[PDB]
Amino acid sequence: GTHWFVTQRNFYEPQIITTDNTFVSGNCDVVIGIVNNTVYDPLQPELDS
Amino acid sequence: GTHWFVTQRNFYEPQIITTDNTFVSGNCDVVIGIVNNTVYDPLQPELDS
What is the number of CB-based contacts under 8 A between chain A and chain B? Predict the structure, then answer.
């Protein structure tokens, strides 16, 4: 109800959405039901730090 | 005939060669029939930030 988490189908283990846990394919205008959220980039703070 | 791609066996989905889709093992003088090409590194362009 607040933030989108990634989890396995056999158990519930909250995990933050990241570029390592997701794959970039297609655009947002194809998938039906796609939702908007913030994908965390682990390299973003490393480059800024 | 232009650039080498990494695609699935059951489906043809051209994708640029990157360090995430492959792993470095052995050398170039062992594997038979190896070809020369360029591997895209996502960390190289991010160095400007």
Answer: 5
Name the structure determination technique: cryo-EM
Identify the CA nearest to A43 among candidates B9, B40, B45, B2: B45
Q: Quote the CA–CA distance of A10 and B20 in Å, as a whole number.
A: 26
Residue owning tokens 């029939």: B33
**Which residues from A are below 8 Å from B46, CB to CB?**
43, 47
Q: Calculate the CA A36 to chain-centre distance.
A: 10
Q: Which helix (H) or strand (E) holds A5?
A: strand A5-6
Measure CA B3 to chain center: 10
Instruction: Pick from B11, B16, B40, B46 the residue to mutate for testing the A interface (most A CBs within 10 Å).
Output: B46
Which residues of B are less than 8 Å from A49 in CB distance? none
Short-list B16, B8, B13, CA closest to B40: B16
